[PDB]
Structure 1
Amino acid sequence: GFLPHFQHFATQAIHVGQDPEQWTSRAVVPPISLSTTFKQGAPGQHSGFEYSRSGNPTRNCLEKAVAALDGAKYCLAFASGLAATVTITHLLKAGDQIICMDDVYGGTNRYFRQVASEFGLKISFVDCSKIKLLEAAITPETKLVWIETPTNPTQKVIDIEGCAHIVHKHGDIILVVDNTFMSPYFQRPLALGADISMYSATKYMNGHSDVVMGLVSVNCESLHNRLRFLQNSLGAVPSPIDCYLCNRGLKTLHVRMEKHFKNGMAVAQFLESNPWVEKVIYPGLPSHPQHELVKRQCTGCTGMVTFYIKGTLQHAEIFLKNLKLFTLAESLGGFESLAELPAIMTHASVLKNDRDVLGISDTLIRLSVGLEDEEDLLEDLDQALKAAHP
């Protein structure tokens, strides 16, 4: 009972922005234009490219492609997911209030809490997975609501349309959905009411663990113009080569994501029947408390699997160190399988008390299940878990 798959996604992934008639050569694959600058026929004419930071062919093609996948009119590429976040935050002004989902990427939490807040911005962390708590937290000063769904790393799921409805009822408030964990193949926040669909393109979008990049998709004309002004003005922009690599990565997004789904489901089911696993959190399992909502707003699920190992931090460490195919490393969304302990690694930057409230304990482990053979991945988890409880 998942949402039906988005029509023409693959066709668009491979072709939007990639029209050969853009190039004098009629190249089937867009060239990588590194050039910082472009010849102009007259001073002050507004006909064509001018300066790479402001706009450049390879970035522009990638932005077109991503926009289409998001069902968006526009998209803006950035130097990283965090830099996308920073740029979006600069839409605001001193005196403004930001509401942020209480469970998010550690660095996002850090940015709002320790940086943005220093500049006249008030930050409230709210469990938006309970729509009425969101409602209760909105103030006349609220200008931005930042959510992940599923959240990193406890994978709480948020009713995007329900949040949209509440957020847009009064005033002028921007709803951002960081769609990093799902990719637009599986979830389209703009279709559900968000004003912005945002990515760490570093993860599934590129999918090849070799590009650090952020993406921001948007429909609203005024909102886009404001964002485009800041892309140019803050200059947190991606290399044109990275744009090329990410675009290239996009061409297999659909077949990569389907295999992440299959492998992730297999891993989740395996862990849930494992005697050395205390609890599994995976949107595609009925055991996930928002599983039905997941099927309502998503076309499938990804490779991210969270689980609590039995025992203590020491068991968690022995498990991680015994993995032979999963790699103990940060990040996610690549072809290769990764494994992490968020409380000590990606989410060390989250306050202890917040970690405890959120349940990011010493025994919470986060998996990014890759595209390897399913049997090899299950064998690796099986032996590492036995190694941990001898």
Structure 2
Amino acid sequence: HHHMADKHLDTALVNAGRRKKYTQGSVNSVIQRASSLVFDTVEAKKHATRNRAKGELFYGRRGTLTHFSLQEAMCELEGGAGCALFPCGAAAVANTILAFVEQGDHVLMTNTAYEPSQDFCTKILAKLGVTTGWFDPLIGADIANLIQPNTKVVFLESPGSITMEVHDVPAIVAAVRRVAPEAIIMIDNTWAAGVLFKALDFGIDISIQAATKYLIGHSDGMIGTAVANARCWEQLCENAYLMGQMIDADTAYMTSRGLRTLGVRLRQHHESSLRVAEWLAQHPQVARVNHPALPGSKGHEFWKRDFSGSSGLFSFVLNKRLTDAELAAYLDNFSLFSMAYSWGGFESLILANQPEHIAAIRPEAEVDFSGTLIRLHIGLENVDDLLADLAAGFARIV
């Protein structure tokens, strides 16, 4: 809930979810693959039915021991009453929002939300009678003026996608609660991996992650999670279940397994990405660095107050708009950074966007820069090698 992580977080990451009933003697939970779950007697079936959302084996779509172990781990780490599981982050966002809306409702979403989240609202929700309005990520307490009589969901994403703006969550939450005390406040907390920003301790109701990113941590598994408080858990659980949302047991196991190294990984991503950001900030070919941990970045003071650390994803703006030829010369010839979507793994990644491309995914807003934007994921490689790779890139476009 503040700038210092729990003195026990690393111990919690190692131990979360690892109860004997799930591990059965191994260090990690067993992998129980199942659709059918067998009842020995009618009485056992009746008991399982009553407890089918409470961790008694009932049916594979409700979960096996492997899912229960992960759910317990996520609830412990994010401080929630329940954790719903999904095939990926985009499914978690879409189905968590859908669980709390109906015809006539209004959603208020940050204009820096991940593009698939925006597209779910404009292309799916709208045709189902749910409207979406937008807010600047630094709106703070002034979000109160945007809350409508039918506003049901306020959707935060801090830091923002691509441009990395950090919300003032305490100011936003206080303003929402003044006007609409029972609104459902949700956050896409993927960048913090759910642990660098303790969303539920700030009065957010549901913390959603693309567990694909830092929880899996190796670029090889896709999964979404949504951890809800006690007020919102049953509605989330049952409405996600009605949409058939689940993850396979093996990916659940790999997510639990990813948690165990999340501390050592995040500490490296923080150290390395802050070093790269500080270097870029001094570079003559860089106009702006968007890194939550870097002084001067948008919302940095809220990151410093409200987060316990940084991950490895950030962006910067070049001192000019690259031509198509320069973009190819720059991006095609990196040695260590690879061009790909996603982030959160062990490898460093790079992508580029022109300002007007970002403006097109900033609803009701324009961008305040004119140079080409570069988004970096800083992996686990030696930082001096990453710096040399970036320096060679600068020399190709100077």
TM-score above 0.5, yes or no? yes
Change (3 A) 1:70 1:358: farther
Supply the distance in 2 between the matched residues of 1:365 and 1:117 (Cα, whole angstroms). 32
- Preserved CA contact (<8 Å) 1:185 1:253: no
Match for residue 74 of structure 1 among 57, 71, 82: 82
1:166-315 equivalence runs, <5 A:
166-171=175-180, 172-221=182-231, 223-314=232-323, 315=326
The amino acid across from 1:37 in the alignment is: S
Report the counterpart of residue 348 of structure 2 in structure 1.
337
Question: What is the DSSP-based 3-state SS (H/G/I as helix, E as strand, rest coil) of the residue aligned with 1:156?
Answer: coil
Name the TM-score, length of structure 2 as normaliser.
0.91
Q: What is the distance in 1 between the residues matched to 2:126 and 2:369?
A: 24
Given residue 214 of structure 2, which amino acid in structure 1 is its aligned partner? Answer: Y
| Separation in structure 1 between the aligned mates of residue 286 and residue 225 of structure 2, nearest angstrom | 35
Residue type of the partner of 1:97? H
CA distance in 1, matches of 2:11, 2:348: 27
Q: Is the 8 A contact 1:199 1:215 kept in 2?
A: yes
Letter in 1 for 2:330: F
Confirm or deny that 1:5 pairs with 2:16: no
> Percent identity of the aligned residues?
28
Are the counterparts in 2 of residues 101 and 128 from structure 1 also a CA contact under 8 Å? yes
Cα distance between partner residues in 2 of 1:63 and 1:87: 17
* 1:52 paired residue number: 60
Asked if 1 retains the 8 angstrom alpha-carbon contact of 2:270 and 2:311, the reply is yes
What is the correspondence of 1:121-132 to structure 2 with a 5 Å cutoff? 121-132=130-141
Tell me if 1:63 matches 2:71.
Answer: yes
Closer, same or farther: CA 136–166 of 1 in aligned 2, 3 Å:
same
Asked whether the 8 Å contact 2:31–2:249 carries over to 1, the reply is yes
Question: Unpaired segments of 5 or more residues in structure 1?
Answer: none
8 Å Cα contact 2:163/2:314 also seen in 1: no
SS in 2 for 1:161: helix
- The residue that corresponds to 2:393 in the other structure is 384
SS at match of 2:46: coil
* Equivalent residue in structure 2 for 1:318, among 323, 329, 337: 329
The residue number in structure 2 matching 1:32 is 31
Cα distance in structure 2, aligned partners of 1:255 and 1:119? 44
Distance in 1 (CA, whole Å) between partners of 2:197 and 2:378 is 18
Give SS of 2:83's match.
Answer: strand
* 318-327 or 42-51: bigger deviation: 42-51
Q: How many residues align?
A: 384
Question: Which one-letter code corresponds to 2:269 in the other structure?
Answer: H
- Cα distance in 1 for partners of 2:148, 2:361 equals 27
User: Alpha-carbon deviation of 1:198?
Assistant: 1.0
In structure 2, distance between residues paired with 1:349 and 1:150: 16
Residue 368 of structure 1: how far off its partner (Å): 0.8
Q: Say if 1:333 and 1:192 are closer, same or farther in 2 by CA, change over 3 A.
A: same
Map of 2:53 onto structure 1: none
Q: Alpha-carbon deviation of 1:20?
A: 2.4
> Following the alignment from structure 2 to structure 1, what is the Cα–Cα distance between the partners of residues 124 and 358?
13
Rounded to whole Å, the distance in 2 between the matches of 1:177 and 1:213 is: 17
**1 CA distance for matches of 2:150 and 2:41?**
46
The Cα RMSD (Å) is 2.1
Q: Distance in 1 between matches of 2:95 and 2:367?
A: 27
- What CA distance in whole angstroms lies between the structure 2 residues aligned with 1:352 and 1:15? 40
The superposition leaves residues 126-171 of structure 1 with CA deviations (integer Å, 9 ceiling, x where unpaired) of: 1142124411110110000111000001111111121111112233
Matched, 1:149 2:148: no
Q: Deviations over 1:164-193 (max 9, x none)?
A: 111122332011111111223311111111
Aligned-partner residue type, residue 5 of structure 1: A
CA deviations over 1:307-341 (Å, ceiling 9, x no partner):
01122232344322221100011111111101112
Partner SS, residue 314 of structure 2: strand
Q: SS of 2:195's equivalent?
A: helix
With 73-82 and 363-372 compared, the bigger mean Cα shift is at 73-82
- Choose 46-55 or 235-244, whichever is displaced more: 46-55
Gaps of 5+ in 2: 49-55
Per-residue deviation, 1:243: 0.7
How big is each residue's C-alpha offset from its partner over 1:69-105, in whole Å with a ceiling of 9 and x where there is no partner? 1122321111111111111122211000000001111
Q: Name the CA shift for 1:268/1:173 in 2 (closer, same or farther; >3 Å).
A: same
Structure 2 counterpart SS, 1:250:
helix
* Cα distance change, pair 111–87 in 1 and its aligned pair in 2 (3 A): same
**Counterparts in 2 of 1:29 and 1:295: CA distance versus 1, 3 Å:** same
Question: What's the offset of the Cα at 1:9?
Answer: 1.4
Letter in 2 for 1:234: M
- Opposite residue 94 of structure 2, the aligned amino acid is V
Distance 2:358 2:319 in 1: 24
Q: TM-score, normalised by structure 1?
A: 0.93
Could you say what secondary structure the match of 2:284 adopts?
coil
Distance 2:365 2:383 in 1: 33
- In 2: Cα distance, 1:264 partner to 1:162 partner: 28
- TM-aligned CA deviation for residue 40 of structure 1: 1.0
Instruction: Report deviation, 1:205.
Output: 1.7
Q: 2:22–2:69: 8 Å Cα contact kept in structure 1?
A: no
